[PDB]
Amino acid sequence: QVQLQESGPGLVSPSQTLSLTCTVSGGSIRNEVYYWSWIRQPPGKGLEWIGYIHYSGNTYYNPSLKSRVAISVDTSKNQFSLKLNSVTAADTAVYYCARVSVGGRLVSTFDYWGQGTLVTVASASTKGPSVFPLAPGGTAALGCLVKDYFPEPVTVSWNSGALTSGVHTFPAVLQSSGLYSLSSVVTVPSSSLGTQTYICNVNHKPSNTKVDKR
Amino acid sequence: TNLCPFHEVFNATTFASVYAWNRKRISNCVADYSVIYNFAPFFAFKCYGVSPTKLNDLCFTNVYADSFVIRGNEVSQIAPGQTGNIADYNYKLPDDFTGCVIAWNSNKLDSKPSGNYNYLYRLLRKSKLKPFERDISTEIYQAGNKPCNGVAGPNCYSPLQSYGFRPTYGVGHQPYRVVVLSFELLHAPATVCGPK
Amino acid sequence: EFMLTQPHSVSESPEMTVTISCTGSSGSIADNYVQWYQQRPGSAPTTVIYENYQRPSGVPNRFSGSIDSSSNSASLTISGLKTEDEADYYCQSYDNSNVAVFGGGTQLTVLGQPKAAPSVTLFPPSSEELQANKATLVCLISDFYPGAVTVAWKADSSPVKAGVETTTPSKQSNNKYAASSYLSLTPEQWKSHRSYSCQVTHEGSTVEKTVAPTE
User: Fold this and answer.
1) Known consequence of changing residue 11 to Q (chain B)?
2) Do residues A97 and A6 make contact, with C-beta atoms less than 8 angstroms apart?
3) What are residue B34's phi and psi, to 5 degrees?
4) What are the residue ranges of CATH 2.60.40.10 in chain A?
5) What is the secondary structure of C116-149 as a DSSP string?
6) What does the DSSP 8-state code read for residue C69?
7) Contacting subunits of A (3+ beta carbon pairs below 8 A)
8) Are A91 and A121 in contact (CB under 8 A)?
9) What is the DSSP code string of B109-157?
10) Cβ distance C154 to C199 under 8 Å?
11) Rounded to whole angstroms, how far apart are CA atoms A179 and A145?
């Protein structure tokens, strides 16, 4: 099917150029849907349209962001990139890329969206995260503690996507030191305390760090 | 030896309508067709009688550049042997046509938020247009047996109809600038040859 | 500009009729199509109604849209509200200059949801963290409907008001909330106490753990 996925630096220093690349699978940037848009959404706020680009170089940007937004199309790789120069503190948002249908009478139908990525705009000494195991009725519960990570996007998928039953990802908190902390526990039966190794898997994309621990 | 003004034909700011399409005669210059590819990916680049890969190697007698803006759903009508409103009443290509039909989207230049009524087309007429025939008539066309005498009666309509051309329209309704290059391939003389 | 305006929040009992307003501050809402997208907490928006009267495959018949040109506004009526429909809804239109404009979002709340009880759980510090001369208690809260849950700690002889980070409760995938409390302290202070108790203050009742640092 048609799937879109965002990519790019998860953290950009202030006053720099925010660059994100959206890779489209199952459909090229061609006569298919004629439009490919970018939509951002700050945490706790509504959607905000950035702009869409046509395969013939036609660009339509937001009036409030006309000076900074610059979108480019690369049909050879089926990827269209967004360049947002001169970033500010209010630019922290989850940037989505979605196709827009133009085959009808008028423009409509934001049909397929992407998963989005949270790109922060703060230069806060981006160190790496750390993991800590949590020691453990017919069922039990235990997990792994994650601390000292500035970029919010983190994944704690257990067993590379296996044993998803009872898995809960509690929201992170902003500590006084400026770092976040994550705690993800999985509900497991008490009979399986001796088998089914609880190897918790973490993946920090902005720092390319993958750690595993029981 | 000098470069032909193909760029000046393509990059024209104000294009003519399909019922009054402009005509430019290219002669006494180096026909370097490589400058055409400097624009955005075209919606239609169909060539007839010649190959688009080796246009710079052939030599042509007369090179006519026809420029007109049409609707996106009507781009397929500009081709040898088609039939439609634009093909019959606005622009008729001959059956033995030799050239390329170059069309690209121009929604950012030829559209306006409040509508762009500068471009018009002929809705109906008495008979079909001959190949390469231009009709700039604006007299009221009569449809019934009774004479209209130049008024908009019950069965009297204007010959021309205006395009909408709003940017929010679909891809089939957006404006498309079409450049039809007519090539008289070395019939009697050899005048306009490519880069050698 | 074509800034659409939506109500900030709306609530109604289930199986009833709920209408979401979408008013245009300028221009005309009839000149361009109006689309409605459903964005659940922690997910990507999904098209619900497009072309103002068309519904794609897979969307239940509970969603239907209409246009009111007499008031230059649109409305999204919901027939038979249920729990799975509690999400954010944005009405989207287009300005005459090819500018796509989204609404402010309407927070739908299912009032007919029953009460819930929090699931308090506490985990002791890890061996590596204790070897690193540090400690951080992790008290987890989940499965509570009212978002007014506060945290508290005890030292079995006096309350604890040290460095404690409390997570802001947010909606889960199942219309419920979750919370967490992190208490960091030195391992000496952790071992020099009889017992700690993460006191979770719910509406009326309270649940604690009373975990002793003795192994």
Assistant:
1) Reduced viral infectivity
2) yes
3) -70, -20
4) 3-119, 130-213
5) -----EEEPPPHHHHHTT-EEEEEEEEEESSS--
6) G
7) B, C
8) yes
9) TS--TT--TT-EEE---SSPPPTT------PPEE-SSS--TTS--TTEE
10) yes
11) 14
Beta strands C73-79 and C17-24, pairing class: antiparallel
As a residue count, chain A comes to 214
Q: Which CATH superfamily is domain B6-193 in?
A: Spike protein, C-terminal core receptor binding subdomain (3.30.70.1840)
Q: Which residues contact C140 (CB under 8 A, 6 or more apart)?
A: A170, A183, A185, C119, C120, C121, C122, C123, C178, C179, C180
Separation between Cα atoms, residue C144 and residue B147, nearest integer Å = 82
B-chain residue closest to A53, CA distance? B108
**A52 vs A35: CA distance, rounded Å:** 6
A63 touches chain B (CB under 8 A): no
Cα B177 → chain centroid: 8
Best probe of the B interface among A36, A102, A105, A107, by most B CBs < 10 A, is A102
Residue C179: closest CA among chain A residues belongs to which residue? A170
- Which tokens go with B137? 């008539």
User: Which of A36, A108, A174 has the highest number of chain C CBs within 10 A, making it the mutation to test binding with C?
Assistant: A108
d(CA A75, CA A79): 7
> C131 vs A132, C124, C126, C185, CA distance in Å?
12, 14, 9, 14
Q: Do A145 and C138 touch (CB under 8 A)?
A: yes
Alpha-carbon distance of C161 to C153, in angstroms, equals 7
- Work out the number of other CB atoms within 10 angstroms of the CB of residue C167: 20
Class of the A3-119 domain?
mainly beta
With contacts defined as CB-CB under 8 Å, which chain C residues touch A110? 35, 37, 45, 47, 92
| Residue at A173: amino acid letter | V
Alpha carbon of B42: minimum distance to chain C alpha carbons (Å): 21
- Looking up tokens 């500068």 gives B118
What chain C holds in terms of domains, given with CATH numbers, is: 4-110 (2.60.40.10), 121-207 (2.60.40.10)
Method of elucidation: cryo-EM
Token couple for C108: 């739908």
Between A55, A59, A106, which is nearest B169 by CB? Answer: A106
Judge: A47–C90 Cβ closer than 8 Å, yes or no. Answer: yes
- Which residues contact residue C71 at a Cβ distance below 8 angstroms, ignoring those fewer than 6 apart? C23
Experimental resolution (Å): 3.3
Q: Which CATH architecture has domain A130-213?
A: Sandwich (2.60)
What residues are paired with A155 via a beta bridge?
A: A203
Alpha-carbon distance of C114 to C112, in angstroms, equals 6
Beta strand C9-12 with C106-110: parallel, antiparallel or unpaired? parallel
Interface touch B107/C97, C-beta < 8 Å: no
Q: Are C108 and C21 in contact (CB under 8 A)?
A: no
Distance from CA of B141 to the nearest CA of A (A): 29
Q: Terminal CA-to-CA distance of chain C, rounded, Å?
A: 65
